[PDB]
Design a protein around this nucleic acid. Structure first.
Ligand SMILES: [Mg+2]
Lengths: 622, 68, 514, 11
RNA sequence: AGUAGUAACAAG
């Protein structure tokens, strides 16, 4: 007999044993070298889907800006960047109709959020691009540099503490004709090229992808506004039922039955219901910043002018953005045995006879965009963080699925969260099902939403997927979507326990770790923990340096259960305990003279997640 | 390496990976009764502290001052 | 509260508008006074009728088998031997913690007295074959040199000899020079970024995986205790878990899980501390026998080259000298990258006579990275995923009845699960076999991890889900079925593991559409 | 006899 | 050589 796990699906429904189609146990695909080549592909593709737009030259920047909006209505089933304003505005309008006041209220709740938000909020971010150094830096370090270079260039409105008042400094910085870094002074033309910058690196640790991708990170000028934009978008998405954001799996599981119920219970015996397991292709590259401006300006109708301006800035900055190329390329001399890293700036003016036939093609096509050796990307949304506001748009089409707006035999509802969606089409006959599917697909193409024909499929309502939640006649997945290392955390005996125990708890609440699996996670954690800190239970024969000391303590102690795992005690944790600090959990069980030492604040080890102050809370050498 | 987990494992394998105040040398004895050395005379390059073995932590918890 | 769009900022804002709106305040006016009037209805009637989502009906007839690439048979890329490995073993009734591996290894080596004058059998096509044989001789020799040393070393750093300098790639990279000092060179072109050379599915990758699902005579994992089962869920949890941990305890894949950890852990430590030393790292795993006594095993030795790792991607070269009874001349295509020696004769006295099989050594220059080593150390999550797959499968099949089917699942002692295929057709196995299989898969997903796999899994899943919808009688339809295939097959290049996982899909599809 | 882990010396 | 795969590592 030759084994073939795939043959399980003969007995088992794919949805049930779908857990078995994920290879997340070995190392992920990491990109080696420089993702400079991968960026130029993203730039050259973005400009291809928008080709037939109008080319402008920026007044401040001098960037070749392509605008595909209101462009030629596509004639093929290729990815269209040509979205229509009247169509996007109609969608927003018909949203405000179906959800009375949705924009009115969101604006009010977001205005409060604008007048509260501290500059502190910017520090809570990913590997941002610091214009102060022209380097990718920590979110906290990049802000501190910016506030300092802003303080020394006559801008301390951030001193008030509010983010809104920092954003004023960002506005006022654009005007100053020279900006000096502590000492290098750059003109207003070369500053704005730094403010409107997206730095690019290849994406490491990305599964379900053969070839690597080019992700981009923005400067600390844009960051501030995008938060406020996403706050408004969030405020709306909270009020929208078809939105899968920002809710957790707890509510998201329910949302699948919530929507299937609507389309099945209504439908009489003479009414077909087909669910399409959806996914949109080139999402980021095919949504134009001007459309998000167009959206925002419609949402902020009858709102204070200051509020409109604040939100309006992000998409304007994104519409005039410039993408840094990367680290560059490497060259190898087969005869002389040499190597050399050519920085990406020099791709502008360099021999084309050095590169190969495919890599030469990309270098040529991007050249006409190169200003300060940083290619401009006026269209598209190269890994933009408008995940929420992009959901508002997506939903606004699902909204147009009511018999009211279709005015036909067929109709639709669904779920949206950024690029991923799931749609149910109801109709009396098969022609209506097709006509409805076409209607949606085309109504999407009008707002630059290009459904992937490859990475999607349709079927009778009952089985489908949305954001990797595999639905089957009411039952939803219920397995772990990415597992962390359940090993030692690398702090100290007392801390590592409280961390590692909580880690497992959090995965059971959020990620949906199975109870039995959680117990094995605990089992594995304890194994690693005991091994690392040589704190094997006092009754074991295992031999470490600490063995004797623990053995003696175990021998002396009356209430064994009392002892911490750190002191050769037994592991008392289990699914119900994973939220109690070990010292608390084992408090009542301890020997008086034991805790009288363990907790004695007169200990030499401490100088002086839910931490408990013990002799275990020591500090490692450095 | 930069990974804390790996670092800790490497650390614990050394004889004296724990930092503690010089006062420990008066409180606890230099050697356990089997002979195992608990703390070292090596001074800390940063503060008024000395190098200590995880055995010291365990020793304090079985022989040490009982305060209610 | 005030916030105004300034001079420089206004001039930008005005350029970032839909075409023929030459001012922001101009545009805002249009938006503010916009009342919709069949704009979409009109633009749709306008737009091309070529643009649409035509529904290709998915019938039992429509799906063809996957297109497996043609070319040379795929080779072994696994860091260490799996089904081919051999162990020199000793009993360890010392209950010792982290006993010094060098000595465990020597004590193991001393148990065998069948060594020969090493002679090359299957030579490495592109390598200085005599260098390998020399390396093994140096290893053999330097382990004796210890025995006559005034003190005893805790770890042996090998002498940087001609052979070891070649096998580990000492000074085999081009020298980094600034562009100014080598700009005008005749053949200064970019690094070769070609397609991986396409290889055909060899029959051995299946044979390797078949032995992964095998049970052994030894207990390969020892998990620590947890608190008493009180809460209702905790009983079910510990029931599920204890059953699974029984079927998996003795599984060969579990030996691989430990083997990988024991190697990667030690390799990554030596990689950090002994950056410039050619450290000898012996390949050791420990297990409990049928009887219960502790047993220490040696699979061979790994000499690590220079380990200067700054990036997680940056590579460390090593040499995998591994003991084996497998004659390499049986499937020499598998051992493409390996140079195989004949390093002794073994004598086994069996109940059917005196068997005298010969002992080989699968020497091979290999590499790994910090990331690849780190994920080798965290191989035990294979058990967690493996258990997750069962737990989820039970959770589901139980939710329809609204009654936990755990005890029913395991206690049902009847071979019911389609799991393998013989020439007879699909063969049914037991939940026990299911567990071990689902583990083995998860292990090989770690051992043979590759973007090809990552991608194939992701795309094939889609087609797999489509196929199920057909079996559910849910009138399935695709939009671009061919496109889906092209995306799947794009990943089927040269990875034995991927090619097999593809073969399996074809195997399934055959029986799925019947 | 087990080709992976066979007994090569007597006891 | 070898890792690796659309560009890197084979120390600086
Ligand atoms: Mg989907």
């Amino acid at each position: 007999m030759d084994v073939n796990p795939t043959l399980l699906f003969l007995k088992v429904p794919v949805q049930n044993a779908i857990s078995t189609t994920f290879p997340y146990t070995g190392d992920p695909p990491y990109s080696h070298g420089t993702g400079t080549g991968y960026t130029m592909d993203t730039v050259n593709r973005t400009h291809k889907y928008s080709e037939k737009g109008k080319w402008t030259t920026n007044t401040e920047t001098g960037a070749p800006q392509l605008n595909p909006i209101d462009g030629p209505l596509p004639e093929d089933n290729e990815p269209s960047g040509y979205a229509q304003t009247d169509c996007v505005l109609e969608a927003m309008a018909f949203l405000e109709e179906s959800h009375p006041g949705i924009f009115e209220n969101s604006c009010l709740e977001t205005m409060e959020i604008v007048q509260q938000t501290r500059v502190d909020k910017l520090t809570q971010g990913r590997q941002t691009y610091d214009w102060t150094l022209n380097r990718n830096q920590p979110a906290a370090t990049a802000l501190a540099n910016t506030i300092e270079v802003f303080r020394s260039n006559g801008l301390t409105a951030n001193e008030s503490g509010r983010l809104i008042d920092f954003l004023k400094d960002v506005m006022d910085s654009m005007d100053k004709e020279e900006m000096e870094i502590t000492k290098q002074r750059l003109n207003k033309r070369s500053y704005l090229i730094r403010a409107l910058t997206l730095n690019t690196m290849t994406k490491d640790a990305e599964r379900g992808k053969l070839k690597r991708r080019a992700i981009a990170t923005p400067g600390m000028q844009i960051r501030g506004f995008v938060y406020f934009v996403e706050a408004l978008a969030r405020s709306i998405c909270e009020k929208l039922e078809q939105s899968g954001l920002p809710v957790g799996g707890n509510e998201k599981k329910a949302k699948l039955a919530n929507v299937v119920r609507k389309m099945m219970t209504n439908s009489q015996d003479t009414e077909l219901s087909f669910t399409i397991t959806g996914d949109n292709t080139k999402w980021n590259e095919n949504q134009n910043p001007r459309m998000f401006l167009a959206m925002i300006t419609y949402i902020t109708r009858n709102q204070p002018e200051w509020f409109r301006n604040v939100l309006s800035i992000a998409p304007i900055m994104f519409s005039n953005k410039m993408a840094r190329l990367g680290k560059g390329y490497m060259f190898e001399s087969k005869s002389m045995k040499l190597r050399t890293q050519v920085p990406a700036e020099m791709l502008a003016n360099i021999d084309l006879k050095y590169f190969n036939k495919s890599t030469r093609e990309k270098i040529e096509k991007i050249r006409p965009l190169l200003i300060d050796g940083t290619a401009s990307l006026s269209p598209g949304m190269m890994m933009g963080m408008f995940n929420m506001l992009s959901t508002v748009l997506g939903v606004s089409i699902l909204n147009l699925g009511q018999k009211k707006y279709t005015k036909t035999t067929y109709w639709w509802d669904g779920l949206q969260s950024s690029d991923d969606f799931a749609l149910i089409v109801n109709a009396p006959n098969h022609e209506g099902i097709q006509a409805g599917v076409d209607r949606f697909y085309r109504t999407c193409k009008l707002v630059g939403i290009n459904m992937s024909k490859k990475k999607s499929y349709i079927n009778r309502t009952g089985t489908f997927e949305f954001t990797s939640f595999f639905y089957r006649y009411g039952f939803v997945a219920n397995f772990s979507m990415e597992l962390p290392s359940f090993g030692v955390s690398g702090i100290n005996e007392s801390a590592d326990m409280s961390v590692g125990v909580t880690v497992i708890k959090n995965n059971m609440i959020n990620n949906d770790l199975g109870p039995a699996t959680a117990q094995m996670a605990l089992q594995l954690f304890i194994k690693d923990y005991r091994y690392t800190y040589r704190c094997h239970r006092g009754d074991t024969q295992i031999q470490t340096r600490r063995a004797f000391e623990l053995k003696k303590l175990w021998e002396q102690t009356r209430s064994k259960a009392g002892l911490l795992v750190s002191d050769g005690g037994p592991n008392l944790y289990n699914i119900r305990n994973l939220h109690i600090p070990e010292v608390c959990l084992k408090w009542e069980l301890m020997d008086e003279d034991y805790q009288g030492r363990l907790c004695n604040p007169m200990n030499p080890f401490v100088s002086h997640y839910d931490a408990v102050a013990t002799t275990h809370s020591w500090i490692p050498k450095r | 390496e930069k990974n804390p987990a790996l670092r800790m494992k490497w650390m614990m394998a050394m004889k004296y990976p724990i930092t503690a105040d010089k006062r420990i040398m008066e409180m606890i004895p230099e050697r356990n009764e089997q002979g195992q050395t608990l703390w070292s005379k090596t001074n800390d390059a940063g503060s008024d502290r000395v190098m200590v073995s995880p055995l010291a932590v365990t020793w304090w918890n079985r022989n040490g001052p009982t305060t209610s | 509260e005030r916030f105004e769009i300034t001079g420089t900022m206004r001039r930008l804002a005005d350029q970032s508008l839909p075409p023929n709106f030459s001012s922001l305040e101009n545009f805002r006016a249009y938006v503010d006074g916009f009342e919709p009037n069949g704009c979409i209805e009109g633009k749709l009637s306008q737009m091309s009728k070529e643009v649409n989502a035509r529904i290709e009906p998915f019938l039992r007839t429509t799906p063809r088998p996957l297109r497996l690439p043609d070319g040379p048979p795929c080779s072994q890329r696994s860091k260490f031997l799996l089904m081919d490995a051999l162990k020199l073993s000793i009993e360890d009734p010392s209950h010792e913690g982290e006993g010094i591996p060098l000595y465990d290894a020597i004590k193991c080596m001393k148990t065998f007295f069948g060594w020969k004058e090493p002679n090359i059998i299957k030579p490495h096509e592109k390598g200085i074959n005599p260098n390998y044989l020399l390396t093994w001789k140096q290893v053999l020799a330097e382990l004796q040199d210890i025995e006559n040393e005034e003190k005893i070393p805790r770890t042996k750093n090998m002498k940087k000899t001609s052979q070891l300098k070649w096998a580990l790639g000492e000074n085999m990279a081009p020298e980094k020079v600034d562009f100014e000092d080598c700009k005008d060179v005749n053949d200064l072109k970019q690094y070769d970024s070609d397609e991986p050379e396409p290889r055909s599915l060899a029959c051995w990758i299946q044979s390797e995986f078949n032995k992964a699902c095998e049970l052994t005579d030894s207990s390969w994992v020892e998990l620590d205790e947890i608190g008493e089962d009180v809460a209702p869920i905790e009983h079910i949890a510990s029931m599920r878990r204890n059953y699974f941990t029984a079927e998996v305890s003795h599984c060969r894949a579990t030996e691989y899980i430990m083997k990988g950890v024991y190697i990667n852990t030690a390799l990554l430590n030596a990689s950090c501390a002994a950056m410039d030393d050619f450290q000898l790292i012996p390949m050791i795993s420990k297990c409990r026998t049928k009887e219960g006594r502790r047993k220490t095993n040696l699979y061979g030795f790994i000499i690590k080259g220079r380990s200067h790792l700054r990036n997680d991607t940056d590579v460390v070269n090593f040499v995998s000298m591994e003991f084996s009874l497998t004659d390499p001349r049986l499937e020499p295509h598998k051992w493409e990258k390996y140079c195989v020696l004949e390093i002794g004769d073994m004598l086994l006295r069996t109940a059917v006579g005196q068997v005298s099989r010969p002992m080989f050594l699968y020497v091979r220059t290999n590499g790994t990275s910090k990331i690849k080593m780190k994920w080798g150390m965290e191989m035990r999550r294979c058990l967690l995923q493996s258990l997750q797959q069962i737990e989820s499968m039970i959770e589901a099949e139980s939710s329809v009845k609204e009654k936990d089917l755990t005890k029913e699942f395991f206690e049902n002692k009847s071979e019911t699960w389609p799991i393998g295929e013989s020439p007879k057709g699909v063969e049914e196995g037991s939940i026990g076999k299911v567990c071990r299989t689902l583990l083995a898969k998860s292990v090989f997903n770690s051992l043979y991890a590759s973007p090809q796999l990552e991608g194939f899994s992701a795309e094939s899943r889609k087609l797999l889900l489509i196929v199920q919808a057909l079996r559910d009688n849910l009138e399935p339809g695709t939009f671009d079925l061919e496109g889906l295939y092209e995306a799947i097959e794009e990943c089927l290049i040269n990875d034995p593991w991927v090619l097999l996982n593809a073969s399996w899909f074809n195997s399934f599809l055959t029986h799925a559409l019947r | 006899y087990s080709p992976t882990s066979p007994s090569y010396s007597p006891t």
